[PDB]
Design a protein around this nucleic acid. Structure first.
Ligand SMILES: Nc1ncnc2c1ncn2[C@@H]1O[C@H](COP(=O)(O)OP(=O)(O)OP(=O)(O)O)[C@@H](O)[C@H]1O
Ligand SMILES: [Mg+2]
Ligand SMILES: [Zn+2]
Ligand SMILES: [Zn+2]
Lengths: 559, 43, 114, 49, 264, 196, 86, 160, 65, 158, 133, 141
RNA sequence: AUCGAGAGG
């Protein structure tokens, strides 16, 4: 297991990673110190010799350089310590161990390697700092974060291996993932929030900013788009400028909820010939989702064009957002005074409902359905009451939040946040649960020594009427800590069991390959499937489409 | 330093979870993340 | 460890010229100038003053990376107008304005008392 | 500010982590598993003073 | 007076000058503030050699503090960049050498100030290298504290530099910048709970511009032309010189661009 | 990292001119993304910002004690008394342009902690190097100039990609390839081989 | 054993070139070019062996034959010129 | 249970219907009970499904259980991957577990089996049975440092 | 451990102020906000340098060698 | 109605309506025979397995049945004219593009589909994070280990 | 290279929804009972009074990279106060002897309903909308 | 003097504790909305009272500011990271030859402090700095 | 080298 299936390897590197908005999706930022350490063996040809000699003259101490020269005899000339490091006269067929240079195939990896996406080929770009740099839209396949994560880099040593990395493992190829038959990369974080802000009909751009954004797109045609508004002042829309990033010939049609062809609320999406007709751009349009811009552009234009689309969109949106600004404060968690009154009244009515159900149960007037304890019925009813209370208070809060509220902005764009976050921060965090039940009596008939015995009230069993803004009480805080400990245990313990499961799954199906007769066989030749997936289709080239004959009435079918 | 001095260990039916009787005796928040989660406690 | 020396932000290196001028493909009468060892201070002023010029159809400056001190200026001008001359005129107008500012501030400061 | 509470062995400062055990001399009743022939057990772990 | 930008100095002191810059595009005012921060040169300690150190502070700590010391740089144009003067390492024409010797002779703590720095190089009659003291006591920046029996003896070489190389060569501390205090241009979109007027505090500079009128439509064509600035100096250089040299350095950069064209 | 579980690493270092500035000329020592906030749900971070802003302006210590009646409304009343907007927002200008940011920025003093993880204590790269005696495989550890391990999961990942030659290169040419002599009849590497 | 060959007429394997065999063909050709091998397409300012091999694949001048093995042990051989690249 | 069913018009409509859920499994006896629909009865225990209805029904129930586990999280995995797993389990004619008991005991080569679990026992029994490893497996070539018959390694490149 | 020479964010020198500040608190019986005001520290970035500083050098001085 | 299928017919139709500038006012130059016979020919053209013998032909017919159902629903004669004002040129281009995309959608022999399947199952499992029935990773362990005794057996009677 | 359409409408309602600067506009054609209009207007650039009467025009001209007005030697084709450029996305028929046309000026939308403009408003990227007080 | 007692957990089983002394007060509505919802105790027969509820925390969690407004796992994370924070671990650091030591140049006391901190000696020996932090999107680095 | 311990995602 430890020396044959896996082993430590040469020509490897590893370091902390941060992200770079100005790096390309398939590119990786490699520190100079790493570049001067890792070498590629390059055989001198008439094509490369004039460069190679220079590198060997440039020396191993400064990049682009080289560290070793291998003669025909197999002797290695060390350029660090050699009296002949100066007068080297390269002969054809010799090998030069050149420094790793820009646009060189490497394999980039993050060690929880659950995906083939976890190891992807990248184009080297050498950088002046100690961290690995990578594009934001490539974080998702690696599950990468910049809170301190370290990533690893491997260097091919033969041209065949470089071809394998560039023709199979390249990042643009892996855009459409075979699992889930959808793209795995998309527009995230600042780019996504800014793209929603930019696509708004209210967003208008002046001539100077328009020109700078147009130049910012690397493949700009130089044709300044005709401004949407002309006479009172030449005003472009954000959609117009962003349409420059969209390649010509791209058509995207999506209808959302109540979307007319007049799109009154700017919902939905219509794009014709790489120009957006209506709608606000958000996670649906430009995320990893099926039928998004990434899937459509990869299928129609090709993986390379989509990979460049990532960078073009990022440049435009990041520039506009930098000059627009975005922020979040405690003011984004405050709810109106009347809204807070209504939230507390919702909590109080839920408390009254719980109390009345309890008084009913104590009177033995409750009747439990078949297969359920009377106490089980009581528990289910109280839990449902309190969960409904939390959800209703949170919805009150979210309706109260204005469009300028930045948490609501991030949720609308889809860059971060959820409804439950708004509810817990602004209205109340609700009921805490351990092992599927409310907090129990660790003490005799009491959850805490501060309560009376045989107390079943919501606050006694771990209901937090307080939002994170209001602040948890002592008992609420202890109950919440009890709840969170369970999640910490689940992380630290689940990981091992899921890893064991994945190892067994991989060892069970490792030999399963599609042979040249379209069958799916194991090492011994036994047929697992006579055709892969029973349709013979690679999972990446597959999208959900509707079968129009199956649905509807017979009359509509006839028509 | 203080924290390393105020530290316990439980060598091994639900030891890891924060028990009710831990109130006021063991810190509810301070625990290692990883294999020693819940088993290692701080006073 | 890997950090470039701070002096690289303003000192031109060997084989590096301040301005590199290259014709622009996909546009008529347009040029791209690569200001080396320069930052936003010069770029924004030059671009705004170019935008003042009537016969300048396009002017935009970008910094392709925060790591490196350099920027790119794209200028497209009217037929019969060399973009290099447009840049020269923008520079001279900038300098005239700055000199006027220096003179007027000096008079005002001489007026003040403390 | 140093609060002490440690030892110095061969120049290295060393702390003794408290070891948590269940008290002896406590009688506890546990239902044995359903397949087990005995329904309940009462156990005492008597430790000398 | 002269056509173009127009300055009205509201208040002025040796430390701060608060003025109004009129009839100017924003890019120019921003470039001027960036130059005032980064590009106007000063003199600062860029080399320290420690003969003896028995203080509780380490040498790197003290050298960093010494580089942070403000030094007179009014005549800094008569000094030359060390990289731009032909000596082997440094000379009198491109550097100023200072000495610091302090012994804790007193039982009570002996403090060290920037006044305790002495100059060994020949100034050659230019106002340069004198440590800046604005303390009413006359004692400088507290460099170190010494117990009885502790000595610090070292030599500093101060050279010419800019804040874009290291913040120690910083002539100005903080520059206050505001345009359109009434937000007539609508260059910002206010964040509010109930009312932007009530929740957002009013600017002082709001008095200087005429208040807006609700009946009139929004002036789309209008661009920001009047700017309210306050420049505060460390004291290594007078404030008036801070702004004047910012102007001059920006001019020099533009002129070097023009010369680069002529040489192209 | 701040005192609320918000860990992060430096992505870029900006000089004061490039940094966004308030009207007072104040500048952030540190800029964090709003996107860290809504998912983590650490309100106390923003409350620390607000309370510390009031504490710096007033010169009095801020009481961030748990289980106190310190409310955001009162702290914001104090901050408004000090002339700044009650919710801690401040109008800020782009450093590169001088144009007012359309947004108003949550701006304030926050306690931050420098952690024991630094990049230059982590950097590693090997190429060729020292090898362990028994396995003839690259040694372990940064301190020994060792080789990063190509784990079983990584072998599986390369298998899913279909890059067989890269796998053979990682598994022999980069770790422990060796040439040995076997007898055709014996079937075992018991051949005594004198090459010269 | 002997004669596991299948005649070109009645060959059932895919007329198109699999991503894996294109990758191996390009890699082998790039290795050959890197080891000072003759090039059968005229170069146009091209010096990377992989790009030379890609151009040769486009112009169908790579003189290599892919031998595909059916699970029974019979082999079907396709010249790179025969196979379709898409 | 709500249910989508063809209306007389042809359109699909929601017909709620009564459904029984039982805490134990006695499949064989229960489906013979009158008044039920024996064609639609279902168990969450797929082994009973295999016992009562045959191996194909076992494979179908296996896919159903795996799918529901995946879809509880909201996670979606394409049919083919789960189908590959289920067909691998059911291709022997019975339920082969992904365990040292189920798939590691097979006719496959010794090295591939020893790379998972019970390594030395497998190697010893290979020595005693005089087993011959085909080396057709990936793990065998990985141990031998040879190119596996995987992707690039499946076909053979030959000169013209 | 000793007073920072200048405010990290502005660069306004604060190393000359420290001692005065202390005498403003003790001799004059002043509160910290007004003391920082008298020292000319008007921006809170400058105020935190003096207000939150801990002068650990005094503890370091007590060590005999 | 919505299921994962190889070739997105709708996108191809929109591409045709834009590439050839379809005009609704003008009458289509397509024959009824053209539409019906061309769709039949396109069905004949799509091949997953290329054997001549009848069992392989039947297997291919199986493999293409559902996609042919989609093709028939999307390219019916009333739809090809009334729903989209497709000219004959657009129709022929749609046919050829459908064939090309389908042939590009086929699996490439050499895909290590077992390893891909195992990873595709395992990655969501490790991401799983948390009523009357066993669920999640424990239930998955039960399923994978063919555990004779499960925590929550259940029978669903209709 | 001439005018495609002209009319004078009256505003019924003006409604900004979640928009500070843009308003949706409902209008009815004068002298044409069956002709109506819907439009997204920048009210900050041109406010729209309720029950206001406005002249509206659609033109083909008066691709090529946009050039600023420079010296104004280029002559306006617009006595109008509000002009936009857009692209039409759909051309549907609402009923026999009636048509409806959709336009998108940079995401600002417009829908016009009238019977006779078969030759006019042909499908094209080209579009100029003009509005006079 | 019997004003304070030591309570085992086993003895905790048999007692009734109040969180604050104000709970032992008469009752007779108009409240500040921003304050937390505190339950009317509606209970009697108290035998004890907590010294202060914030004492349930350990040394590490006593450093956290406003942890009652934070989701608990983040409090755990911070408790694990304050031990990784850098500061003056002792004032005699120059005297001892520790294998590794890291010390801040200019340590700052926190602007937001716990009342527990005084007994933890944090303000006297801090391990962080009061950095001016802006929350903003700015070039997206 | 073995064994233990602590941390990181
Ligand atoms: N699509 C996403 N949606 C919501 N939150 C996300 C998303 N992606 C990442 N996160 C956040 O990133 C964190 C998840 O931790 P993550 O799984 O990335 O770390 P890990 O290395 O896998 O395990 P650990 O850190 O516990 O050792 C959480 O804070 C989560 O909220
Ligand atoms: Mg993480
Ligand atoms: Zn000199
Ligand atoms: Zn300051």
């Amino acid at each position: 297991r430890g020396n044959l299936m896996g082993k430590r390897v040469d020509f490897s590197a590893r370091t902390v990673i941060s992200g770079d908005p100005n790096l390309e999706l398939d590119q990786v930022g490699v520190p100079k110190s790493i570049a001067k350490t890792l070498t590629y063996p390059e055989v001198v040809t008439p094509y490369n010799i004039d460069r190679l000699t220079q590198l060997v003259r440039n020396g191993p101490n400064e990049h682009p350089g080289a560290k070793y020269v291998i003669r025909d005899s197999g002797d290695r000339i060390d350029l660090r310590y050699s009296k002949r490091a100066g007068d080297i006269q390269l002969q054809y067929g010799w090998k030069v161990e050149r420094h790793i240079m820009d646009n060189d195939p490497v394999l980039f990896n993050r060690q929880p390697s659950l995906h083939k996406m976890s190891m992807m080929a990248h184009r080297v770009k050498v950088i002046p700092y100690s961290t690995f740099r990578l594009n934001l839209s490539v974080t998702s396949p690696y599950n990468a974060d910049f809170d301190g994560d370290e990533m690893n880099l491997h260097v091919p040593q033969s041209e065949e291996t470089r071809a394998e990395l560039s023709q199979l493992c390249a990042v643009p190829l892996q855009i459409v993932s075979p699992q889930s038959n959808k793209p795995c990369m998309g527009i995230v974080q600042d780019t996504l929030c800014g793209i929603r802000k930019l696509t708004l009909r209210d967003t208008f751009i002046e001539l100077d900013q328009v020109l700078n954004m147009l130049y910012w797109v690397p493949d700009w045609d130089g044709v300044i788009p005709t401004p949407a508004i002309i006479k009172p002042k030449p005003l472009w829309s954000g959609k117009q400028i962003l349409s420059v990033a969209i390649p010509n010939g791209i058509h995207l049609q999506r209808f959302d909820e109540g979307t007319t062809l007049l799109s009154p609320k700017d919902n939905g999406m219509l794009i014709i010939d790489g120009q957006i007709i209506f709608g606000v751009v958000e996670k649906k349009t430009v995320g990893s989702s099926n039928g998004g811009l990434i899937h459509v552009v990869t299928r129609e234009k090709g993986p390379q064009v989509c990979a460049k689309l990532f960078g073009n969109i990022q440049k435009v949106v990041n520039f506009w957002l930098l000059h627009n600004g975005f922020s979040t404060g405690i003011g984004d968690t405050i709810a109106d005074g009347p809204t807070m009154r209504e939230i507390t009244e919702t909590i109080a009515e839920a408390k009254k409902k719980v109390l009345d159900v309890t008084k009913e149960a104590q009177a033995n007037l409750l009747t439990a359905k078949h297969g359920m304890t009377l106490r089980e019925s009581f528990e289910d009813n109280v839990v449902r009451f309190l969960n409904e209370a939390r959800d209703k208070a949170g919805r009150l809060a979210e309706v109260n939040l204005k469009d300028l509220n930045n948490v609501k902005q991030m949720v609308m764009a889809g860059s971060k946040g959820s409804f439950i976050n708004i509810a817990q921060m602004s209205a109340c965090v609700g009921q805490q649960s351990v092992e599927g039940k409310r907090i129990a009596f660790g003490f005799v008939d009491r959850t805490l020594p501060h309560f009376s015995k045989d107390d079943y009230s919501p606050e006694s069993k771990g209901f937090v009427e307080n939002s994170y803004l209001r602040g948890l009480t002592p008992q609420e805080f202890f109950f919440h800590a009890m709840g969170g400990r369970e999640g910490l245990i689940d992380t630290a313990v689940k990981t091992a069991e899921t890893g064991y499961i994945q190892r067994r799954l991989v060892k069970a199906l490792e030999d399963i390959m599609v042979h040249y007769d379209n069958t799916t066989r194991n090492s011994l030749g036994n047929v697992i499937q006579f055709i892969y997936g029973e349709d013979g289709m690679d999972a990446a080239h597959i999208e959900k489409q509707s079968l129009d004959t199956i649905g509807g009435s017979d009359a509509a079918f006839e028509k | 330093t203080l924290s390393h001095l105020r530290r316990t260990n439980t060598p091994i039916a639900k030891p890891r979870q924060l028990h009710n009787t831990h109130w006021g005796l063991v810190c509810p928040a301070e625990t290692p993340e990883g294999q020693a989660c819940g088993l290692v406690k701080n006073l | 460890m890997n950090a470039p020396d701070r002096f690289e932000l303003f000192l031109l290196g060997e084989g590096e010229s301040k301005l590199k001028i290259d014709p622009d493909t996909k546009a008529p009468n347009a040029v791209v100038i690569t200001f080396e060892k320069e930052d936003h201070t010069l770029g924004n002023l030059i671009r705004a003053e170019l935008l003042n010029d009537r016969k300048v159809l396009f002017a935009a400056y970008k910094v392709e990376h925060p790591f490196f001190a350099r920027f790119k200026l794209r200028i497209q001008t009217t037929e019969g107008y060399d973009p290099k001359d447009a840049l020269k005129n923008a520079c001279n107008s900038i300098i005239n304005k700055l000199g006027a500012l220096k003179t007027n501030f000096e008079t005002e400061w001489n007026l003040q008392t403390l | 500010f140093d609060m002490g509470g440690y030892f110095i062995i061969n120049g290295s400062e060393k702390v003794l982590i408290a070891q948590e055990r269940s008290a002896g001399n406590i009688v506890q009743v546990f239902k044995k598993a359903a397949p087990s022939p005995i329904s309940h057990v009462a156990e005492i772990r008597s430790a000398l003073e | 007076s002269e056509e173009g930008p127009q300055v009205k100095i509201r208040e002025a002191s040796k430390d701060n000058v608060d003025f109004i810059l009129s009839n100017v595009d924003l890019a120019m005012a921003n470039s001027l503030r960036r130059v005032m921060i980064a590009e106007i040169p000063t003199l600062a300690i860029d080399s320290v050699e420690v003969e003896t150190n028995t203080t509780v502070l380490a040498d790197e700590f003290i050298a960093h503090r010494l580089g942070l010391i403000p030094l007179q740089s009014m005549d800094i144009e008569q000094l030359e960049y060390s990289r731009d003067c032909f000596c082997e390492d440094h000379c009198d024409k491109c550097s100023v050498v200072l000495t610091l010797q302090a012994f804790g002779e007193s039982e009570s703590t002996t403090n060290v100030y920037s006044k305790d720095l002495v100059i060994v190089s020949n100034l050659m009659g230019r106002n340069i290298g004198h440590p800046i003291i604005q303390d009413k006591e006359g004692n400088g920046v507290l460099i170190c504290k010494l117990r009885k029996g502790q000595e610090l003896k070292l030599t500093c070489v101060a050279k010419k530099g800019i804040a874009k190389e290291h913040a120690k060569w910083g002539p100005a501390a903080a520059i206050e910048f505001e345009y359109d205090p009434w937000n007539k241009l609508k260059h910002t979109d206010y964040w509010y709970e109930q009312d932007s007027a009530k929740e957002w505090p009013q600017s002082k500079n709001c008095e200087y511009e005429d208040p807006p009128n609700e009946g009139d439509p929004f002036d789309y064509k209008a661009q920001a032309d009047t700017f309210y600035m306050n420049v505060e100096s460390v004291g290594s250089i007078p404030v008036d010189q801070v702004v004047v040299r910012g102007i001059d350095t920006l001019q020099k950069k533009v002129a070097s661009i023009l010369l680069a064209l002529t040489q192209m | 990292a701040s005192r609320h579980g918000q860990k992060g690493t430096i992505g870029i270092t900006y000089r004061r001119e490039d940094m966004p500035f308030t009207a007072e000329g104040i500048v952030p020592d540190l800029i964090i993304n709003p996107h860290a906030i809504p998912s983590r749900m650490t309100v106390a971070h923003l409350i620390e910002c607000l309370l510390s802003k009031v504490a710096a302006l007033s010169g009095n210590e801020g009481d961030a004690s748990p289980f106190t009646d310190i409310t955001v409304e009162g702290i914001s009343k104090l901050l408004r008394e000090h002339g700044y907007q009650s919710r801690g927002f401040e109008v800020m200008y782009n450093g590169h342009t001088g144009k007012k940011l359309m947004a108003q920025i949550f701006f304030g003093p926050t306690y931050y902690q420098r952690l024991r993880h630094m990049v230059d204590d982590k950097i590693h790269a090997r190429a060729r190097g020292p090898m362990q005696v028994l396995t003839r495989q690259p040694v372990e550890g940064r301190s020994r100039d060792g080789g990063l391990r190509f784990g079983e999961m990584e072998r599986d990942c390369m298998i899913a990609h279909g890059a067989a030659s890269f796998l053979k290169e990682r598994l022999m040419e980069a770790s422990d390839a060796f040439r040995v002599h076997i007898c055709g009849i014996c079937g075992l590497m018991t051949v005594i081989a004198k090459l010269n | 054993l002997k004669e596991k060959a299948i005649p070109k007429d009645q060959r059932a394997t895919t007329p198109y070139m699999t991503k894996y065999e294109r990758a191996r063909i390009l890699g082998t050709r790039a290795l050959q070019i890197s080891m000072n091998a003759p090039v059968f397409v005229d170069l146009e300012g091209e010096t990377d062996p992989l790009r030379i091999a890609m151009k040769e694949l486009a112009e169908k001048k790579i003189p290599l034959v892919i031998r595909r093995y059916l699970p029974d042990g019979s082999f079907e051989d396709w010249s790179v010129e025969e196979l379709i690249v898409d | 249970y709500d249910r989508k069913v063809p209306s007389p018009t042809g359109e699909y409509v929601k017909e709620p219907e009564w459904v029984l859920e039982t805490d134990g499994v006695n499949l064989s006896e229960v489906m013979t009970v009158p008044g039920i629909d024996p064609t639609r009865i279902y168990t969450n225990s797929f082994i009973d499904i295999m016992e009562v209805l045959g191996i194909e029904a076992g494979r179908a129930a296996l896919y159903k259980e795996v799918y529901n586990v995946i879809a509880s999280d909201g996670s979606y995995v394409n049919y083919r991957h789960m189908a590959l797993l289920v067909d691998v389990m059911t291709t022997q004619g019975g339920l082969t577990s992904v365990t040292r008991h189920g798939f590691n005991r097979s006719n496959t080569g010794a090295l591939m089996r020893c790379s998972f679990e019970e390594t030395v026992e497998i190697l010893f029994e290979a020595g005693a049975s005089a087993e011959l490893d085909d080396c057709r497996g990936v793990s065998e070539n990985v141990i031998l440092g040879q190119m596996a018959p995987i992707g690039t390694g499946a076909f053979d490149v030959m000169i013209d | 451990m000793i007073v920072p020479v200048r405010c990290f964010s502005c660069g306004k020198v604060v190393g000359d102020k420290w001692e005065s500040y202390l005498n403003l608190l003790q001799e004059d019986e002043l509160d910290e906000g007004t003391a920082l005001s008298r020292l000319g520290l008007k921006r809170y970035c400058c105020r935190r340098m003096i207000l939150t500083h801990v002068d650990l050098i005094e503890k370091f001085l007590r060590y005999n060698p | 109605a919505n299921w994962p299928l190889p070739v997105n017919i709708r996108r191809i139709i929109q591409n045709a309506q834009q590439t050839f500038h379809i005009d609704h006012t003008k009458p289509s130059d397509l024959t009824i025979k053209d539409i019906v016979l061309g769709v039949k020919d396109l069905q004949e053209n799509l091949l997953v397995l290329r054997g001549k013998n009848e069992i392989i032909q039947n297997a291919q017919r199986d493999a293409v049945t559902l996609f042919c159902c989609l093709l028939r629903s999307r390219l019916a004669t009333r739809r090809v004219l009334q729903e989209y004002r497709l000219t004959k040129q657009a129709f022929d281009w749609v046919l050829s593009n459908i064939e090309a995309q389908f042939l590009r959608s086929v699996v490439h022999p050499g895909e290590m589909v077992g390893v891909l399947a195992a990873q595709s199952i395992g990655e969501p499992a490790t991401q799983m994070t948390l009523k009357k029935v066993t669920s999640g990773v424990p239930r998955l362990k039960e399923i994978l280990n063919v555990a004779k005794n499960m925590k929550t057996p259940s029978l669903t009677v209709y | 290279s001439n005018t495609l359409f002209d009319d004078i409408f009256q505003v019924s309602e003006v409604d900004p929804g979640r928009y500070n600067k843009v308003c949706r506009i409902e209008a009815a054609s004068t002298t044409q009972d069956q002709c109506k209009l819907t439009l997204d207007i920048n009210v900050e650039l041109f406010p729209v009074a309720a029950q206001d009467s406005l002249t509206v025009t659609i033109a083909s001209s008066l691709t090529r990279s946009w050039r600023p007005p420079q010296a104004g030697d280029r002559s306006l084709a617009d006595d109008y106060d509000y002009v936009m450029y857009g692209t039409a996305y759909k051309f549907e028929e609402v009923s026999k002897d009636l048509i409806a046309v959709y336009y998108s000026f940079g995401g600002l939308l417009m829908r016009l309903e009238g019977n006779y403009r078969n030759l006019n408003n042909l499908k094209q990227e080209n579009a100029y909308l003009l509005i006079r007080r | 003097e019997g004003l304070v007692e030591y309570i085992d957990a086993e003895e905790e089983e048999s007692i009734l504790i109040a969180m604050q002394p104000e709970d032992l007060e008469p009752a007779e509505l108009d409240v500040d909305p921003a304050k937390r919802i505190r339950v009317s105790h509606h209970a009697t027969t108290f035998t004890h009272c907590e010294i202060h509820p914030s004492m349930i925390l350990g040394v590490a969690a006593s450093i956290i500011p406003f942890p009652d407004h934070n989701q608990s796992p983040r409090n755990t994370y911070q408790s694990a990271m304050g031990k990784q924070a850098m500061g003056v671990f002792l004032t005699n650091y120059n005297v001892r030859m520790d294998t590794m030591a890291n010390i801040l140049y200019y340590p700052q006391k926190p602007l937001g402090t716990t009342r527990a901190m005084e007994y933890l000696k944090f303000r006297e020996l801090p391990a962080g700095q009061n950095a001016i932090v802006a929350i903003a999107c700015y070039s997206g680095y």
